[PDB]
């Protein structure tokens, strides 16, 4: 399933006559250019190569510019090859936008997680702290639940440590479509989207039945 | 049902049958006496 | 190992054609069966059959004692086939045939809606009788054993799919 690459902006409310204000996450679409169209020549597969919107491209390298010359005359953002499924997906006719959401009402959104620095355990991993009461000092928030006794000898991922977390691929599947307008190029969903304003938000309709 | 650990040949309508490595009780007159293993 | 001695006997309505391991048999049940004598060898005498062991295959008369039954079951299979014995009990319960798809209503959320194997027909002469049609004695018994397994017969109600048999598994009530 092709992703539409919507970018993060913010949340709004939209109301109904029963006074319910209906908070919804906002995404404004610009859609794909389509820049290769692969069919059969490499490993029998079909793939679109989408390219999103436009960019200033003020310092691009020749390895990028020689590809922009065969893609068109205006330089887009990203790449995303997007492999197509047999009898399920097509590249033929007009290129597609928000008609992906005309009857499918659950979606998935890939993005990039925020940087947690030290990360730790008692916030990120739902662990309890030690209390500063009863004359207790020196170890209140310091991790140390790592063994017994000599029996463990090797460590599994149910044990948690400090170290850099964030700045990698993260995906959410909690989102429900509340309003779509193809003439306003607008998608409104219930629930929140990961990471920072701008970014990418790859956004595609759900494949779970 | 039960398995217990041993089987008896208590009536004439019971014959006791070994199928696919296991011995079992079946009685067409009384399902109360179904038993596995022996 | 006594049954490999048997003459088997065949009706006039079968011509019994043979070439090496391949036996070709046909009759008025719409079937043209090609069955194999690969591990054992059979000899025909126009009305009777004799089986025996092959070179490089199992010794004695045991694997031959099975081969007679399968050939008899196919001589029957191509001439007239096998008779009905599967039944349904319960009011509003219904068996139905939708081409290669079968239906069985048992008071539940969906009517089975299952699709038949290769080489078998289903028929319902009344909504509580189930007949399976073909030439293979196995598929017409295997599909009945897969069909009877849906919800299984109820103890006091007696309801569900049953066989014609003098034994009773329906239970009677007790005083409290």
């Amino acid at each position: 399933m092709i992703g539409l690459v919507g970018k993060k902006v913010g949340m709004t409310r939209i109301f109904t006559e029963d006074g319910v204000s209906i908070p919804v996450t906002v995404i404004e679409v610009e859609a794909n250019r389509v820049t290769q169209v692969k069919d059969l020549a490499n490993d029998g597969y079909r793939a679109i190569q989408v390219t999103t919107g436009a960019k200033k491209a003020n310092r691009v390298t020749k390895p990028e510019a020689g590809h922009f010359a065969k893609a068109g005359v205006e330089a887009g953002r990203g790449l995303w090859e997007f492999r197509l499924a047999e009898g399920e997906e097509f590249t033929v006719g007009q290129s597609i936008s928000v008609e992906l959401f005309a009857d499918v009402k659950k979606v998935d959104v890939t993005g990039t997680s925020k940087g947690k620095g030290f990360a730790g355990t008692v916030k990120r991993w739902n662990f309890r702290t030690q209390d500063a009461t009863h004359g207790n000092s020196l170890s209140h928030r310091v991790p140390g639940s790592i063994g017994q006794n000599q029996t463990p000898g090797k460590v599994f991922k149910g044990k948690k440590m400090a170290g850099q977390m964030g700045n990698e691929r993260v995906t959410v599947q909690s989102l429900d479509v509340v309003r779509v307008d193809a003439e306003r190029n607008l998608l409104l969903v219930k629930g929140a989207v990961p990471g920072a304003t701008g970014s990418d938000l790859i956004v595609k309709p759900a494949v779970k039945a | 049902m039960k398995v217990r650990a041993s089987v008896k040949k208590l009536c004439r309508n019971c014959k006791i049958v070994k199928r696919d490595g296991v011995i079992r009780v079946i009685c067409s007159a009384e399902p109360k006496h179904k038993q596995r293993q022996g | 190992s006594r049954v490999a001695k048997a003459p088997v006997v065949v009706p006039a309505g079968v011509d019994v054609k043979i070439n090496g391991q391949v036996i070709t048999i046909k009759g008025k049940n719409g079937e043209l069966t090609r069955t194999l004598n690969d591990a054992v060898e059979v000899k025909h005498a126009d009305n009777t059959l004799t089986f025996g062991p092959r070179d490089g295959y199992a010794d004695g008369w045991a694997q031959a004692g099975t081969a007679r039954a399968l050939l008899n079951s196919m001589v029957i299979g191509v001439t007239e086939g096998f008779t009905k014995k599967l039944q349904l009990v319960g009011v509003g319960y219904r068996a139905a045939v939708k081409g290669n798809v079968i239906n069985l209503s048992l008071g539940f959320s969906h009517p089975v809606d299952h699709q038949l194997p290769a080489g078998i027909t289903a028929e319902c002469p009344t909504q509580t009788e189930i007949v399976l049609k073909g030439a293979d004695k196995q598929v017409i018994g295997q599909v009945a054993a897969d069909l009877r397994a849906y919800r299984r017969p109820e103890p006091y109600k007696g309801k569900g799919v049953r066989y014609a048999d003098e034994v009773v598994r329906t239970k009677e009530a007790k005083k409290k």
């Binding site: 090797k154 599994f156 991922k157 149910g158 | - | -």
Partner: protein, 142 residues
């Protein structure tokens, strides 16, 4: 005089192929390992390479004795908490038939990397053909 001490400049490479039709896995894998080690060419040294390159023509044509398709459990583990991962010939042969002999020789070859030095000379294929017609592998018998 001393017995033959091998120099690393002695090394030689030739290509072979063997048909798997109806053959029992262990009676093929043991014969394969003996030719893989180079016992027809060079011996009396683990200090120098002795092996020759050999193709198993079609892995889907292999068999096992009696009921042994259900035999063995192929246990392995390293971590991700407890639980031993198990396999069966009946689950390999319909997925990738090349796999059943790729695992078989691993107890027949010596030690650690000394057996791996011969495992680099092994090829297995499925589908009645291979990719090495330019190496001209010579046919083995029987």
């Amino acid at each position: 005089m001393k017995t033959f001490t091998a120099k690393p400049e002695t090394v030689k490479r030739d290509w072979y192929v063997v048909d798997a039709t109806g053959k029992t896995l262990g009676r093929l894998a043991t014969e394969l390992a003996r030719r893989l080690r180079g016992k027809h060419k060079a011996e009396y040294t683990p200090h120098v390479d002795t092996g020759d390159y050999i193709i198993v023509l079609n892995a889907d044509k292999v068999a096992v004795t009696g009921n042994k398709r259900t035999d063995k459990v192929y246990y392995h583990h390293t971590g991700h908490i407890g639980g031993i991962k198990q396999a069966t010939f009946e689950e390999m042969i319909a997925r990738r038939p090349e796999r059943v002999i790729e695992i078989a020789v691993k107890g027949m070859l010596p030690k650690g990397p000394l057996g791996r030095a011969m495992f680099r000379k092994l090829k297995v294929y499925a589908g009645n053909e291979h990719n090495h017609a330019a190496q001209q592998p010579q046919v083995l018998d029987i």
